[PDB]
Design a protein around this ligand. Structure first.
Ligand SMILES: Cc1cc2nc3c(=O)[nH]c(=O)nc-3n(C[C@H](O)[C@H](O)[C@H](O)COP(=O)(O)OP(=O)(O)OC[C@H]3O[C@@H](n4cnc5c(N)ncnc54)[C@H](O)[C@@H]3O)c2cc1C
Ligand SMILES: Cc1cc2nc3c(=O)[nH]c(=O)nc-3n(C[C@H](O)[C@H](O)[C@H](O)COP(=O)(O)OP(=O)(O)OC[C@H]3O[C@@H](n4cnc5c(N)ncnc54)[C@H](O)[C@@H]3O)c2cc1C
Ligand code: HEM
Ligand code: HEM
Ligand code: NI
Ligand code: NI
Lengths: 214, 205
């Protein structure tokens, strides 16, 4: 269920490392079953304490399926680089990946406002304090859902090593190494309907460097 | 509509992003794994250990859903309701076919050349033992069995919010190769190979 089979010295049980990954990557891929068939869809998520939270239209069939109790598996992955070995067999990727399992719970109408504010502040930190409150109609058009991050329902796999070359290939010489991969925020692009010379909000001024989820 | 039907655009995404997430069903319940993939013409190809339980399930006929996503930006609107991510995502459905022993060498070389272009012509051939330890699987990309969602919009704010002012826009995200890191057991002054020197700028088509 939660135990890695292959290269299981890459499995980590640190919850702290888990949070670090979940607070870095804003995209999750969610898998569920419909009529015996698998389905998978990407979606933004934020970790709000010990819950993974998503949201979307109350009219999405996918989100409705989860709201109705479809058991789910949630995958979150950071691709950190390419492992260039002296053979193709030992070539690889550096990455960090988490997989979480359970049933999403529907956030109650009374709680949606608070979870959505916290979700927004994952995606664009400090943004909630800059915006107007959501309207009752906006909230009624939104389904928010939360999956519990417990002790037993998650697995973390970490690969950040170097090529592991056969001694034969070493002897032959040749270059080996890692080409890193990073995901970075670009300079912001102002929308055409924004008044000329309007400043960047502080929250957006923060969206610089390598992509994070807090 | 944000659903695209262009096979050319699908290929463009599959030739950009090397990570897939594969969903399948074990015991009426869902499982999801990340894996590297390459597009080899009209097949999406993955590989790993003959001893991996989940690759074995695929090999055994388990129907799959394969998701490939590129995150392109943060859509920052005047309201949190209208804020979102710019992204491209494909989902492909079907059953992976096991690649035959006689065919694996060719497919794995093609796969290598997706992940590190030009690299196979630089390396020695894989050994029989290496091949034998490897399971390679291919999912057909047909006319029917996929969908492509492309959201590359600007924020669409209500009139009342535009009139109230405030900034809005898009903060792009890009994924870039960094400077190579030479492994500890390589001699100082061994030059970078041509394949590696070609790996600069964006994770790119
Ligand atoms: C960016 C990236 C690229 C990858 N490319 C490849 C590839 O090209 N070939 C390949 O074989 N593998 C690749 N993997 C790893 C792949 O996800 C599996 O770890 C691998 O196939 C071995 O799985 P298994 O047989 O051990 O899992 P199984 O024994 O079938 O699964 C048992 C349990 O292990 C845990 N687990 C397994 N893998 C992961 C994971 N990756 N993250 C979190 N939890 C996990 C889960 O809880 C799971 O239910 C890649 C991973 C990442 C992040
Ligand atoms: C980076 C990223 C972040 C996202 N964040 C959010 C979010 O925060 N909230 C939210 O509601 N949605 C988000 N989405 C979109 C999500 O994938 C769905 O499009 C959305 O939940 C509505 O799905 P649906 O119920 O209309 O599709 P359904 O009607 O349930 O599915 C029908 C079929 O349409 C096709 N399809 C649907 N979506 C996609 C896709 N994305 N890629 C390829 N094929 C597809 C599939 O074949 C699917 O089986 C995000 C997508 C990306 C890539
Ligand atoms: C050239 C680029 C290649 C890349 C980027 C690549 C990447 C990977 C990755 C990411 C893994 C998963 C390791 C893990 O679980 O953490 C893996 C496993 C594996 N790859 Fe590759 N690979 C490549 C080429 C090859 C080739 C050519 C073969 C065979 C000839 C091969 C055989 C295997 C095998 C057998 C495993 C299973 C590892 C194990 O569980 O012991 N790979 N590969
Ligand atoms: C603040 C950061 C937020 C981000 C990054 C975000 C992101 C997204 C994304 C990516 C989508 C998918 C659009 C698509 O289908 O292509 C979406 C849909 C949606 N979001 Fe958000 N969102 C945010 C805040 C909010 C809030 C606070 C609400 C409600 C109060 C809201 C309500 C919705 C609704 C209803 C949809 C479905 C749109 C539709 O299909 O009609 N969002 N969001
Ligand atoms: Ni609030
Ligand atoms: Ni060949």
């Amino acid at each position: 269920s939660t135990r890695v089979t292959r290269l299981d010295e890459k499995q980590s049980t640190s919850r702290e490392r888990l949070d670090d990954l979940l607070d870095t990557i804003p995209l999750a891929t969610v898998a569920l079953v419909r009529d015996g068939h698998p389905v998978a869809f990407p979606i933004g998520f934020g970790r709000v304490g010990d819950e993974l939270v998503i949201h979307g239209s109350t009219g999405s069939p996918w989100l409705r399926a989860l709201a109705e109790g479809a058991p789910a598996a949630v995958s979150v992955t950071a691709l950190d680089g390419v492992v260039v070995a002296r053979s193709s067999f030992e070539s690889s990727f550096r990455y960090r990946s988490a997989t979480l399992f359970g049933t999403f719970e529907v956030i109650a109408d009374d709680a949606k406002r608070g979870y959505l504010d916290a979700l927004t502040d994952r995606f664009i930190p400090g943004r909630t304090a800059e915006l107007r409150a959501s309207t009752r109609k906006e909230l009624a058009a939104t389904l928010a859902l939360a999956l519990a991050i417990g002790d037993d329902n998650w697995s973390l796999k970490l690969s950040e090593g170097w090529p592991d070359d056969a001694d034969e290939d070493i002897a032959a010489g040749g270059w080996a190494g890692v080409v890193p991969l990073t995901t970075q925020y670009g300079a912001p692009l102002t929308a055409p309907d924004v008044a000329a010379g309007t400043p960047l909000p502080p929250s957006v001024r923060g969206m610089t460097g390598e992509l994070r989820n807090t």
